[PDB]
Design a protein around this ligand. Sequence first.
Ligand SMILES: Nc1nc2c(ncn2[C@@H]2O[C@@H]3COP(=O)(O)O[C@H]3[C@H]2O)c(=O)[nH]1
Ligand SMILES: Nc1nc2c(ncn2[C@@H]2O[C@@H]3COP(=O)(O)O[C@H]3[C@H]2O)c(=O)[nH]1
Ligand SMILES: Nc1nc2c(ncn2[C@@H]2O[C@@H]3COP(=O)(O)O[C@H]3[C@H]2O)c(=O)[nH]1
Ligand SMILES: Nc1nc2c(ncn2[C@@H]2O[C@@H]3COP(=O)(O)O[C@H]3[C@H]2O)c(=O)[nH]1
Lengths: 194, 194, 194, 194
Amino acid sequence: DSSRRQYQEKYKQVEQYMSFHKLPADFRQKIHDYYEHRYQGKMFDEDSILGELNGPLREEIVNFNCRKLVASMPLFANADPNFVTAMLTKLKFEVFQPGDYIIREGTIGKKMYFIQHGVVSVLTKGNKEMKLSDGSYFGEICLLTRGRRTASVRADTYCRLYSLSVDNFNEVLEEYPMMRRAFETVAIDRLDRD
Amino acid sequence: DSSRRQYQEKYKQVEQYMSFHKLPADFRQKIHDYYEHRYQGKMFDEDSILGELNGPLREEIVNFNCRKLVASMPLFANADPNFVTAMLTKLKFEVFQPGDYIIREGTIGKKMYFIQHGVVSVLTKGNKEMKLSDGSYFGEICLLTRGRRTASVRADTYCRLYSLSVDNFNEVLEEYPMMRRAFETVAIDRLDRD
Amino acid sequence: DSSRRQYQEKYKQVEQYMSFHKLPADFRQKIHDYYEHRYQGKMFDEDSILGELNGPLREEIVNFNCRKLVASMPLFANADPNFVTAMLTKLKFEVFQPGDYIIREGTIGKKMYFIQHGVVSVLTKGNKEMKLSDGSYFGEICLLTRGRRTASVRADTYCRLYSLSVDNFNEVLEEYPMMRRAFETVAIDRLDRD
Amino acid sequence: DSSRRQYQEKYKQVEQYMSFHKLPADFRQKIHDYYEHRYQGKMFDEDSILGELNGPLREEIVNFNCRKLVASMPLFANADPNFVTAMLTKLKFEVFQPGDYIIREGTIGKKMYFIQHGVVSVLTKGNKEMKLSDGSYFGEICLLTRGRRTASVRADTYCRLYSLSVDNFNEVLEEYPMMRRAFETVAIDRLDRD
Ligand SMILES: Nc1nc2c(ncn2[C@@H]2O[C@@H]3COP(=O)(O)O[C@H]3[C@H]2O)c(=O)[nH]1
Ligand SMILES: Nc1nc2c(ncn2[C@@H]2O[C@@H]3COP(=O)(O)O[C@H]3[C@H]2O)c(=O)[nH]1
Ligand SMILES: Nc1nc2c(ncn2[C@@H]2O[C@@H]3COP(=O)(O)O[C@H]3[C@H]2O)c(=O)[nH]1
Ligand SMILES: Nc1nc2c(ncn2[C@@H]2O[C@@H]3COP(=O)(O)O[C@H]3[C@H]2O)c(=O)[nH]1
């Protein structure tokens, strides 16, 4: 287990970084849990690994790892496989902890998020707290309008998300333009209930 | 043999990556063979190596390694040596396995491929399966039209190819503009038989 | 202490670099002290560390490390927290030694500096030497005019600064445009006393 | 001597790279000598080293290392020190071996070269072989015209040069526009003797 060694080795550097910058014990413990939920005691230079492979193998891997998320939402489940692949390839896996501000209402949004696992709270103003969990996405509004976030989104529980930047978003829709409607339909239904 | 060590060391990380992401035994074995045909039990940071050298040495190396491919097709064999060099420098060696989708008809193409060794099948629609092997290239159509792939291309056997992106393609033709005809002649003969 | 090892290990390479390039004993000793005041016997790949984290954790860290600087000047102390964060994220910590030319009058300026700790001398021409220390910034003039430096700025004592490039400067003001006045007010008061 | 170890360690990888690609014994020996004249048995990650420093220290280092070249040619010797520094910072040290084609007449030139040590031959067509050695530069013609190389330039002896790309060239002249005349005067005298 050299990957395991990579984790333990890397985390010790994180413990020293925190010590050097004299971070509180509360924060250090948070950092700790983050690494644990995010990496799970095993680290690999995924960029280097996948870079050693080819397109097919890479697409095959991403499709397999995201298999859960795929069948989870209609968008990818009934869509063109080549669309699904192109989209997944651009996704960035991120892990958020309870209470984190995934989206802060009022700021220029540049990313949307797909929920693989977890629950988020949506504060539009006073009281919404609408909840979103496994199988749904959020943040598509500003990717479509290029304006300010119309709401706040925080992690309720531990959230295993996949982010997509506005640029990679438009890059994919450059090839599958009709798929942009799926995101619009959702952004409209949403802006409507407000 | 430290390079050999680099390979074995790197592959073990790949074995752990796959285990962590619980990939099937069929896939793991495919990955395995890929690394074997692609690297052949020896890894070097080629980017770092060549970066330590200078232009002449680098060009000399690429010309020597691609020597086979060069004499293999008319394009490079009778062309201006400086054209041949400029072109080779931009090439990316890739290895495809039996059944892989090198090109998927209908997608916006951004790369063309030169076959050093192997055989590919060309599906234009129903039944073509035209075959291409050592000494020929494919994918130049979209590099010239900037449109969709007019056919599918899959690896029949194990394929040792060299890819060229549309940007590096136009960059070279910026200096040897007349050489663009060679690719056109082929793209026309081809679009003609359709 | 592997970080400590990283420092000692890295500094020995610096000692050999200097030896190879036969640098004077005076300079070598300066380099030495630089590493000591800048790193303090402990090195971490901060880019790699923070890259392993997420946005929230990263912002939390930068806010904590810069906490001193924040309460130190009005600009960040009474400003919008999201503005403060966005700004800090773009800051680059730098350490200058006694007598260094932080800004050389007459050159096209592209960076401004916030003083966390230290004292600087401002030569406008003959004799000014106006002094600036903890809690104030300089260099905003050219970030606003895109012209030449209107004065020279040198480190009196050892200076622990934070730099901000003109691009990252305008990027933040793209989201908090009204905050640009704070820098203008200061650039005007200053150009006025000249 | 860990730097020495870095060299020997790195060169062994180069020996294995060459073996893997079955390069001739003549070439391997050339590569060998290159590493020897270029690095001299000691390797350091200069990019990483200098990146750990600050602007002043970096400029001080480059000025010291290039001190020879500076006093060697009028251009830097009588010029504005800030011009000299800006220029040096953009220079790339390169080492050419006897018989190498530094510049190949007829190609779109993007770099000029300053000779620290060595002698080059200039073939304009039949017979020139004009020689240039320590203290002079070449290649400025295309940086000024953005056209084709008007001559060939080869290393006679072992050449220790410093290159400057057209972009970094125009970037510096953006700040010291009048200094562009120095290069013009030389490009004119030269085009004149043709
Ligand atoms: N305004 C609004 N946003 C919603 C709602 N449900 C989910 N969201 C998401 O909350 C997000 C906040 O940031 P964006 O406006 O960019 O994208 C928004 C939506 O995708 C809703 O009912 N109203
Ligand atoms: N359409 C077509 N493509 C061919 C044929 N033979 C080879 N090809 C290659 O198949 C490729 C599919 O992708 P491109 O159209 O980009 O480039 C095409 C050609 O280079 C042929 O007979 N017809
Ligand atoms: N001209 C001028 N500059 C000042 C003064 N006080 C501080 N400075 C700073 O000195 C800096 C020199 O570079 P800039 O002109 O870019 O930015 C200038 C200011 O921010 C002052 O009184 N006059
Ligand atoms: N044409 C020409 N080039 C010269 C001569 N002496 C030196 N050179 C250099 O040879 C170089 C060849 O490439 P460039 O024309 O770009 O730049 C040219 C000059 O800087 C000369 O006498 N005639």
